[model samples]
Target chain A: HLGPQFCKSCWFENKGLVECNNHYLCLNCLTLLLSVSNRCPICKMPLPTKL
Target chain B: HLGPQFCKSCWFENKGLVECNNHYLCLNCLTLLLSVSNRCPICKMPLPTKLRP
Candidate 1:
């Protein structure tokens, strides 16, 4: 709601940005990361189902 | 990155939660609301394309 729209990894415009351990992710990218691992792509912290 | 997982409206557990003007939304609920309107369901403010700057 009050932040930038760029994905920390992809660095593209995105509507759905998820906050993960101080890093941000596009919903699409997060989904892809989820499929790959439980850790955040930037922070490398374990992601919760709701992260 | 650190907060509860409950949606403000539906009160359901959801992944991909987005913070909007201090209000939290589950991604699913936010998506549904986006399909309906651009204003946030809770804050009633215009939602931006990106939240973090």
Candidate 2:
């Protein structure tokens, strides 16, 4: 966990967070984002099918 | 400066920075990357022409 970064979408203290456009997000949030809008929760960029 | 983060490409300490896909980057390095490949330095995502404020 880089700087023990929290998930930007939910602010959850999680270790399995992945970066999206540099903002670390939890896998669950990422999944939700993908299903909802396929966009980065913070920046609203189009999320890639693969990360 | 969120957490006074350092530049990912050059590690330079800067106040004026922008986020590309989530990685905080300095404006100067962002400019350079835009000129070179127009990609995020850390994640290599195609950067938008409009830099974040």
Candidate 3:
């Protein structure tokens, strides 16, 4: 069962994820995610990387 | 010459100027200037159409 803590990338969910750059983040990290960078900080994939 | 740029409206220091949509503004203007049709560019009050011309 997919819970709310999923990374949506590797589905790691524990260490949290980085969205806008090297910033370690969480699911609610929207403002920081949208500010500058456009790639997933960890995997370096294009953000909104899922769908 | 003006040393550091200043926004006349908010009186915030900035780097340069932008005159458009009938007003002058500085960089800190943000989306506030683009979000409304009222408010002074400087004092943030209602703007006038300059009827003297």
Worst 10 residues of 1 chain B by lDDT: B5-14
Stretches of candidate 1 exceeding 4 Å from the true structure: A1-4, B1-53
- Give the lowest summed-lDDT range of ten residues in model 3 chain A: A27-36
State the lDDT of candidate 2 residue by residue for A1-51, as single tens digits. Answer: 334487655454367777777577666556655754565546667664654
CA lDDT of each candidate? 0.60, 0.59, 0.41
What is the number of backbone collisions in each predicted candidate, taken in the order shown?
Answer: 6, 6, 3
DockQ for the candidate 3 complex? 0.03
lDDT of 3 by residue, B1-53 (tens): 33335444333334556543344455434334343344443445454433233
The digit string of per-residue lDDT tens for model 3 on A1-51 reads: 334544432232345454433333444333333343465444465555321
Instruction: Please identify model 2 stretches exceeding 4 Å from their true place.
Output: A1-51, B1-4
Candidates, ranked, lDDT: 1, 2, 3
> Residue B25: error of model 2 in Å?
1.1
**Second chain TM-score, each model:** 0.67, 0.68, 0.38
lDDT tens readout by residue for model 1, B1-53: 53566555444445666776665766655665575567764566865447585
Chain A TM-scores for all candidates read 0.72, 0.70, 0.35
Q: After superposing candidate 3, which stretches have Cα over 4 Å from the reference?
A: A1-51, B1-5, B20-24, B38-53
